[PDB]
């Protein structure tokens, strides 16, 4: 149940990852993904390749962002691997100076939150407003401004069972939130000094954490302009934190009007209560836990040195700890990738560290995860 937030008021290089939803077997139907993450602003040209030819009929996920407001997308397509077929992802972004090509080298509590993105398009019509509602790491609604008939549209196998009353009120809010955000972007060109020739962003987020006690643990209501913190709701659910001078101008305006009062009522009330329902309706998937499947692979770059890689596959929830240790700890001199979404609700990740060939049996990787009952440890052993 969305909340009707009726109150008006950096550039990161993408991290392109091309991988396969499952280990690649020649001739076996497999999914190819191009998960670009950690980029900002939102605009990005992503296109999956196959032997230099662009692939059509690819599928991509709804725009979201992490805690630091950096965006991420999952471009994937159904394919079948072979020996000859080489696959690349052609990602282009403003930070890059030429399109980046990444070849598919085979060897390479709870919380309901509502992310919204409003990207102004000064000459391409009304602002591109896209909003997504999550539960823990799972997605369960979306509402795109540019859809044929903009409507709160389910994205989970347990949410579509809601009745019309659910979708009519949620749709009403989103079409109100879009018009609220649209006003915000117009005024932010005024607070700052910005020409009407550039496209900007206004990300907003809110939600309700809920510890095991079934009561609100910390409410969220944040805002970002152009990819940086703008104004946030403090844990007390009564004050505001302004991250810059312009955020102070608006911070007073939301203290006199006591907008936080409505947020607390929903955050402490309607927000958590529905989260409990979503957990009760979707208890099949949200409350699940799949332990990672772990395998360690070694490929040498020399006759006496090599890079050792520990793989974690098919686990949910996303949060996982995975790092390398010698004799049982290498926080530095280690390479660790962003957690990868497999596109089926599960995630993947790996970590690598260089090693001299000898005494590799001393090394080990340790896997800690919510779904894991006991700590884990493994080392390469052909």
């Amino acid at each position, epitope marked *: 149940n969305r909340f009707l937030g009726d109150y008006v008021v950096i550039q990161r290089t993408p991290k392109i990852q091309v991988y396969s939803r499952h280990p690649a077997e020649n001739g076996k139907s497999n999914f190819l993904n191009c998960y670009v993450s950690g980029f900002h602003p939102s*605009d990005i*040209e*992503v296109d999956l390749l196959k032997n230099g030819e662009r692939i059509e009929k690819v599928e*991509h996920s709804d725009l979201s962002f992490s805690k630091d407001w950096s965006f991420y*997308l999952l471009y994937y397509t159904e394919f079948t691997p072979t020996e000859k077929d080489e696959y690349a992802c052609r990602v282009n972004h*403003v*930070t890059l*100076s030429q399109p980046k090509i990444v070849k598919w080298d085979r060897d390479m509590s709870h919380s309901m939150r509502y992310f919204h993105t409003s990207v102004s398009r000064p000459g391409r019509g009304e602002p591109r407003f896209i909003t997504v509602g999550y539960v823990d790491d799972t997605q369960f609604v979306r509402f795109d401004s540019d859809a044929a008939s903009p409507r709160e549209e389910p994205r989970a196998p347990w949410i579509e069972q809601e009745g019309p009353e659910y979708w009519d009120r949620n749709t009403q809010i989103c079409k109100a939130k879009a018009q609220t955000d649209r006003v915000g972007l117009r005024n932010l060109r005024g607070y700052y000094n910005q*020409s009407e*020739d550039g496209s900007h962003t206004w990300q907003t987020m809110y939600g309700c954490d809920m510890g095991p006690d079934g009561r609100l643990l910390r409410g969220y209501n944040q805002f970002a302009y152009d990819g940086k913190d703008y104004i946030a709701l403090n844990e007390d659910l009564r004050s505001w934190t302004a991250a810059d001078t312009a955020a102070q101008i608006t911070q007073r305006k939301w203290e006199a009007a006591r907008v936080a009062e409505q947020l607390r009522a929903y955050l402490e009330g309607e927000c958590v209560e529905w989260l409990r329902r979503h957990l009760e309706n979707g208890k099949e998937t949200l409350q699940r836990a799949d332990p990672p499947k772990t395998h360690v692979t070694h490929h040498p770059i020399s006759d006496h040195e090599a890079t050792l890689r520990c793989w974690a596959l098919g686990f949910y929830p996303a949060e996982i700890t995975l790092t390398w240790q010698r004799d049982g700890d290498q926080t530095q001199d280690t390479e660790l990738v962003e957690t990868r979404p497999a596109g089926d609700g599960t995630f993947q990740k790996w970590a690598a560290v260089v090693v001299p060939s000898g005494q590799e049996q001393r090394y080990t990787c340790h896997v800690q995860h919510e779904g894991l009952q006991e700590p884990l440890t493994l080392r390469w052993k052909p």
Partner: antibody
Amino acid sequence: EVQLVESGGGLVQPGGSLRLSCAASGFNVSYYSIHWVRQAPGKGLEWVASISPYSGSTSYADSVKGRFTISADTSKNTAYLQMNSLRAEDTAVYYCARYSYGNSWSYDPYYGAMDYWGQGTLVTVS
Amino acid sequence: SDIQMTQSPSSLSASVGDRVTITCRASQSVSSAVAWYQQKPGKAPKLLIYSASSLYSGVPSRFSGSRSGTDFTLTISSLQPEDFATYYCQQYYWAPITFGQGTKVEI
């Protein structure tokens, strides 16, 4: 109103060096990657180099790689091109180009557009 | 290997109002990342089409592009006296950016 102005042109002896300037106006260059293209007299258009001003990542065409150093300044809101070890063939009216990146998460995936070219400025190697 | 844009004809004369098409081919499978530029004498190129099909904002509606395989066609539906210029193909899909040798139209 978006409009770019180029400067730094004139004459130069072969083997010399010149520093071209393309001062943007009407938009923050940090939102775009400024590409440099040259046209020999009555010939095709050749791409020179490109600067992503915010991250300063740059790429150079092999025809000038190792001789040309490109640069930008967000605070000044201008684009600079350093040319050294000049060759006779480098005569052209140099245009600075404004790449405008697109997106694919739209329902109709786009591609960027080199929408705005500068007026050009002649540079004679002689 | 640089991606040459084989553009033909080197020139072609058409009467005012005529329907004209300009072909352009890439040495590999360049995708719809192709744009068309108009260069009047002693002037900087001006964008006409991008994404290989989309009319650029403000450009006359008669101008249009279409991609079929790796062959790109720039269409004049009704030539006007202001369409005299050395038109150019281009490919920004692959680095480096390259342009076709040009197409001189005489009126």
